[PDB]
């Protein structure tokens, strides 16, 4: 199958926005997923977004203000789910 | 050219090891 992934680091006090720490196609993508699952880092399937996000940004640099809309929605879902346990 | 491209390849490769090592620091991954 086709494979893509975008890894993001975000602290609430230090980062104004999410830093792209990795982006990946094919076996690179799969590697990021695997290490992450390995670290119990959440993984979200959002294809129109992952697609739209890939060419847009680069490794080590905080996402565009434009993306704040869909990314923040995701960080939100991720964290709502993790609250109960 | 054989060498310039071998240098390029290797820089590509090195950039990738850095990147995959920085993944343990992620908080979220978006996937297709």
Residue numbers in the entry:
A (entry chain B): 264 to 348
B (entry chain A): 232 to 263
Please share text taken word for word from the publication where this structure appeared.
The membrane protein FlhB is a highly conserved component of the flagellar secretion system. It is composed of an N-­terminal transmembrane domain and a C-terminal cytoplasmic domain (FlhBC). Flagellar FlhBC consists of a globular domain composed of a four-stranded β-sheet surrounded by four α-helices. The globular domain is preceded by a long N-terminal α-helix (α1) that connects the cytoplasmic globular part of FlhB to the transmembrane domain.
In the case of the AquFlhBC crystal there are three protein molecules in the asymmetric unit. The three molecules in the asymmetric unit are very similar, with r.m.s.d.s on pairwise superposition in the range 0.40–0.76 Å. Each molecule consists of two polypeptide chains resulting from proteolytic cleavage after Asn263. In all molecules no electron density was observed for residues 213–231 at the N-terminus; depending on the molecule, two to six residues at the C-terminus were disordered. In the SalFlhBC crystal α1 primarily contacts α1 and α2 of adjacent molecules, while in the AquFlhBC crystal α1 primarily contacts α4 and the cleavage site between β1 and β2. The major difference between SalFlhBC and AquFlhBC is in the N-­terminal region. However, a longer helix with a kink is not excluded in AquFlhBC, in which a highly conserved Gly230 occurs just two residues into the disordered segment 213–231 which is present in the crystallized protein but is absent in the model. A similar positive cleft is also present in AquFlhBC. Such a cleft might be a potential recognition site for proteins secreted by the flagellar secretion system.
